[PDB]
Design an enzyme around this catalytic site. Structure first.
Site, PDB file in Angstrom:
ATOM      1  N   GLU A 176       1.349  -4.140 -13.845  1.00 45.30           N
ATOM      2  CA  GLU A 176       2.383  -3.145 -13.722  1.00 45.30           C
ATOM      3  C   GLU A 176       2.406  -2.354 -12.427  1.00 45.30           C
ATOM      4  O   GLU A 176       3.371  -1.621 -12.124  1.00 45.30           O
ATOM      5  CB  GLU A 176       2.212  -2.099 -14.840  1.00 45.30           C
ATOM      6  N   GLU A 226      -5.499   7.428 -10.702  1.00 43.48           N
ATOM      7  CA  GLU A 226      -4.695   7.754 -11.884  1.00 43.48           C
ATOM      8  C   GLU A 226      -5.665   8.163 -12.999  1.00 43.48           C
ATOM      9  O   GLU A 226      -5.518   9.280 -13.498  1.00 43.48           O
ATOM     10  CB  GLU A 226      -3.844   6.576 -12.347  1.00 43.48           C
TER      11      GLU A 226
END
Lengths: 446, 106, 419, 37, 33
Positions: A60, A137
């Site tokens: 992704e 992240e």
């Protein structure tokens, strides 16, 4: 003049269609300007092994950064040139990439999406660039108690199962992850019949079907030998996972009872039930007048900051419950009111009460479907979830069969005498002892 | 059909109010109220003036009670001056709670 | 099937309606009262008003109002901006009547009781607190208060020192002067216009001229700087944009997009975004930056927003500027304007692809123009922008009085004289 | 009016009471009551 | 508070008609552009 029911029946039906390989084509027409084409692949985080636990989620970040056809920034540029936004979302069961764009842009739209799914130019540079991003992240996700807790929840209710792993994946699997492994991942899970190409708006189904680039198919079996469930039931063990950090200002609690798969007559009745308890925040205009007790109490007595009931629905698993963030000295009172609400629900539901939640559900379920993006996701996800139906008009019917007895019997399967799945992220010092929570699911007194 | 009766009824009322300790005490009928949950919320809704006044009159009252002395004839509460200042507030509070109760039937 | 249907009355209130197919109808009375309508003595009263929408009114007690809408599964949203205040009302086709009589009470019959309005007060702090969690809100807010002097520099959120001091007469006076016929626009997404009008006629006829709050515009270059302890620093740089629904404005919008960096791709980087490119090249690894573009009745604000780290603040900030200087030096090739355009067009359409979106768009237009401009026409207008026009507008930022607002550790944040 | 609201409890309530009353007597084992079974 | 460390930042304000539109609803609540 026109009346709710009527409107319902009049809505544009969804056309499900299939390519030779199993590519599924769906679409809702309106002959409107903007369109949101999407490809809703259903190989998520629950297929990953311990190592590739974060594979999917890593794909992704590369989805949009190059195709052998379109190298370095050629996707975005073209996407920017097209004027259609491109998003990629990934769940523990469902990865999806979609485009928003002017209806006349289908031509290069659907090309782009198709392109994206198949060819992804992934160089060592992009892998090592993404790694660094991912790791960052992860650090950021740790800064979010709601996200920290909701993982927790899944890990404890799903302890000892592939399903209990973070979609973000384990820290170090990001470091280790072999470049060869994204391939196998993709190769093995991106093969339709899994995939669905959906869309809503101003297009003609006919043309979507045709437009589908028929380039690669399901390289799988023709017989039962495949039938060995990749979707093997997952134990949803009842436990708790308490993670106390008196350094944080507020307290996160997510309490659950295991629930139905995606498809089940009990599964709409439940929603009607959580209509009743509802959801609440520091800023709700109604405070003390809200008709939901947890909401009123909370509003009135400064019991919580924000609380929300949920129904998480998976093929062979379900997470039901609510979740409340409360000061350190209010954990127990909030736990008391909620569970309380549950119990009352399966013994004492009144037709009034159920009828109001009923109606709430309708609206919730109609208003979500406002806009092109929303309709596209329902259509895509609906197909892997509930199969190829679009129960939209049915709903109202199903919702209609709702009775106060129906709601009471359906709730008591799942909450009464059943063992909770409780996670917090302390100040959890006052959080109820597992046995206390447990005894809260039956009614002697309190 | 209350003409004579109304006047007669009014006449009976003055005697009870005058007769009552509240008139003698100097605390208006509204300060004699049993402080319960509805009265309590109506009280809270009072203006600084209205509200502080009730505090002084009860202050002066409970002071007299403590000493067993009555206020001077000149300074008493006269029936004709029935400040039913609580009434307004008190009404709604009940009004609102009646509604709430009723809304809870089904 | 049937397209909208506007109708200005003798009062001057606008009303529209679209019998749609689907199950969900949504009314919304947009009253013209923004935050720009308060003075030094009135500041923070819209804010409180926004938060008092469930209080007792003449026909409906706070209890009935909330339990009522619950009954039926409705929602009552009270949205506001610096110029307007939309009062939204969603619910099921069959229940609009129960719901409408609620919207009417809430808006024309408010009864702000000393006791009720007093309980709220504290909600203001809670509300302010949660909204100030996003640096965007306090910077954006600070921006408006530095660039304006009088009216639009009033923020949306009550000033700390006013909170408990917002009196009942204040609410009652703001409603009275601003929640009036001339400033209002009904808007239905699933209601009969014939039956809408009737109701509008029966309940929305109140008199009140504009500017009893003190209407007027004015721009003033200024800088508000907020020091913090946070690694990251946000800052805005903005000069007078063109006004609302005017050609210059529109131009700006299109220029905005040439630089404008709102990612259209998840986890994706912009290749289109000039600002991003330029910034990026002279900038570090982690950073983010976007073109800012505001337009209101009687002035605008155009310029960009930055989010850097402590020692990059300047570098980023300048970098951004320089690049927008480039376009104002004339350097801008045709290819990029057309992409921009199509980006914008796409955007507007998606913006109105939802009920909630549409209903805002419609009301919005009602308050500005007095009618509903169809999308198509809209689309034409944006296209008319000249490739030069864009540059020309951009010229104006660089040669327009600067006004900036930053937060964080400000060792490395350029001042006015720095750029 | 009241019964409809408490109807669910009424059925559930009825069962608990009979069980409780019978159980106390059963634990109690009073002879006269028992003789009947 | 949500950490804003990476490339992901993509927040900056500019819409068509609405600009910095704050909603307060009886149920939900928010801040857009």
């Amino acid at each position: 003049t026109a009346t709710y029911a009527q409107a319902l029946q009049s809505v544009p039906e969804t056309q499900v269609s299939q390519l030779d390989n199993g590519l599924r084509v769906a679409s809702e027409q309106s002959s409107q300007p903007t369109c949101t084409v999407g490809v809703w692949i259903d190989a998520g985080s629950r297929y990953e092994s311990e190592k590739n636990n974060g594979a999917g989620y890593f794909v992704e970040h590369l989805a949009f950064k190059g195709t052998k056809n379109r190298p370095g920034n050629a996707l975005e540029k073209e996407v920017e040139s097209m004027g259609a936004h491109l998003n990629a979302y990934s769940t523990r069961e469902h990865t999806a990439y979609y485009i928003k764009a002017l209806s006349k842009d289908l031509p290069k739209a659907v090309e782009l999406l198709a392109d994206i799914v198949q060819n992804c130019s992934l160089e060592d540079s992009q892998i090592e660039k993404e790694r660094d991003v991912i790791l960052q992240e992860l650090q950021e996700n740790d800064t979010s108690m709601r996200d920290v807790v909701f993982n927790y929840l899944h890990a404890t209710a799903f302890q000892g199962t592939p399903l209990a792993q973070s979609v973000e994946g384990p820290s170090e699997n990001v470091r280790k992850l072999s470049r060869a492994d994204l391939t196998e991942y993709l190769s093995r899970h991106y093969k339709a019949p899994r995939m669905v190409l959906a869309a809503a708006g101003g297009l003609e189904h006919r043309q979507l079907l045709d437009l589908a680039q028929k380039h690669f198919s399901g390289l799988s079996g023709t017989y039962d030998e495949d039938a060995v469930p990749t979707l093997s039931p997952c134990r949803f063990t009842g436990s708790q996972i308490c993670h106390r950090e008196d350094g944080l200002p507020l307290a996160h609690v997510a309490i659950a009872v295991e629930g139905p798969g995606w498809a089940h007559p009990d599964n709409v009745a439940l929603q009607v039930a959580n209509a009743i308890i509802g959801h609440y925040d520091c800023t709700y205009g109604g405070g003390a007048h809200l008709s939901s007790p947890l909401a009123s109490i909370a509003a009135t007595n400064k019991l919580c900051q924000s609380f929300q009931t949920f129904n998480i629905c998976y093929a062979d698993t379900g997470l039901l419950g609510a979740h409340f963030v409360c000061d350190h000295m209010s954990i127990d009172d909030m736990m008391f009111v909620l569970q309380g609400q549950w119990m009352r629900l399966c013994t004492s539901a009144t037709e009034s009460e159920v009828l109001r939640g009923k109606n709430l559900l309708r609206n919730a379920l109609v208003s979500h479907l406002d806009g092109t993006t929303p309709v596209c996701e329902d259509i895509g996800r609906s197909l892997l979830t509930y199969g190829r139906r679009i129960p939209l008009a049915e709903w109202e019917s199903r919702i209609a069969e709702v009775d106060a007895r129906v709601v009471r019997e359906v709730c008591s399967k799942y909450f009464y005498d059943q063992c909770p799945a409780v996670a917090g992220f302390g100040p959890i010092e006052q959080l109820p002892d597992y046995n206390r929570i447990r005894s809260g699911m039956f009614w002697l007194r309190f | 059909a209350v003409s004579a009766s109304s006047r007669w009824l009014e006449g009976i009322r003055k005697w009870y109010y005058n007769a009552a300790g509240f008139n003698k005490l100097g605390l208006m009928r509204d300060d004699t109220i049993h402080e319960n949950d509805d009265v309590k919320e109506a009280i809270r809704r009072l203006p600084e003036n209205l509200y502080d006044d009730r505090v002084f009159r009860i202050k002066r009252a409970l002071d007299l009670s403590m000493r067993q002395q009555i206020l001077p004839k000149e300074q008493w509460t006269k029936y004709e001056e029935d400040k039913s200042y609580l009434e307004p507030y008190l009404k709604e509070v009940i009004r609102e709670r009646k509604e709430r109760e009723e809304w809870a039937k089904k | 099937p049937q397209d909208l249907e506007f109708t200005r009355l003798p009062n001057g209130l606008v009303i529209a309606s679209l019998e749609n197919y689907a199950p969900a109808s949504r009314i919304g009375l947009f009253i013209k009262a923004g935050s720009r309508y308060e003075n030094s003595n009135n500041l923070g009263t819209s804010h409180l008003l926004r938060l008092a929408s469930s209080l007792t009114t003449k026909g409906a007690s706070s209890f009935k109002i909330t339990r009522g809408i619950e009954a039926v599964g409705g929602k009552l949203s009270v949205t506001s901006t610096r110029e307007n205040m939309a009062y939204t009302v969603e619910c099921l086709r069959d229940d609009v009547d129960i719901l409408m009589e609620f919207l009417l009470n809430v808006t024309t019959a408010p009864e702000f009781r000393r006791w009720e309005v007093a309980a709220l007060q504290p909600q203001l702090r809670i509300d302010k607190a949660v909204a100030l969690q996003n640096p965007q809100a306090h910077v954006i807010e600070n921006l408006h208060a530095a660039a304006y002097r009088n009216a639009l520099a009033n923020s949306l959120y009550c000033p700390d020192y006013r909170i408990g001091k917002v009196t009942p007469v204040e609410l009652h006076d703001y409603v009275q002067n601003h929640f009036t016929s001339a400033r209002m626009a009904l808007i239905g997404l699933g209601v009969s216009h014939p039956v809408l009008k009737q109701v509008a006629e029966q309940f929305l006829n109140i008199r009140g001229g504009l500017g009893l709050s003190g209407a007027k515009a004015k721009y003033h270059g200024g800088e508000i700087r907020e020091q913090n302890g946070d690694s990251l620093v946000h800052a805005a740089l903005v000069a007078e944009s063109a006004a609302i629904g005017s050609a210059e404005a529109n131009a700006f919008s299109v220029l905005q997009h040439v630089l404008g960096a709102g990612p259209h791709v998840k986890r994706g980087s912009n290749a289109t975004s000039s600002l991003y490119q330029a910034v990026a090249k002279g900038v570090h690894q982690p950073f983010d930056v976007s073109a800012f573009n505001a337009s209101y009745s009687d002035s605008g604000l155009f310029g960009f927003y930055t989010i850097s780290q402590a020692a990059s603040a300047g570098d980023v900030i300048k970098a951004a500027y320089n690049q927008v200087k480039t376009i104002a030096q004339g350097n801008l090739s045709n290819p990029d304007v057309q992409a921009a355009k199509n980006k914008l067009k796409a955007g507007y359409l998606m913006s109105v692809e939802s009920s909630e979106g549409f209903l805002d768009e419609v009301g919005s237009q009602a308050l500005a123009a007095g009618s509903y401009t169809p999308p198509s026409t809209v689309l034409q207008q944006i296209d008319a922008v000249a490739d030069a026009d864009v540059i020309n507008a951009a010229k104006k930022f660089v040669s327009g009085r600067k006004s900036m607002a930053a937060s964080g550790n400000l060792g490395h944040t350029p001042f006015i004289d720095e750029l | 009016r009241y019964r409809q609201l408490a109807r669910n409890w009424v059925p559930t309530a009825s069962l608990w009471g009979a069980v409780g009353a019978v159980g106390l007597v059963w634990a109690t084992d009073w002879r006269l009551i028992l003789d009947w079974v | 508070k949500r950490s804003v460390l990476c490339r992901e930042s993509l927040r900056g304000q500019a819409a068509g008609r609405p600009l910095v539109a704050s909603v307060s609803l009886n149920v939900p609540a928010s801040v857009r552009y």
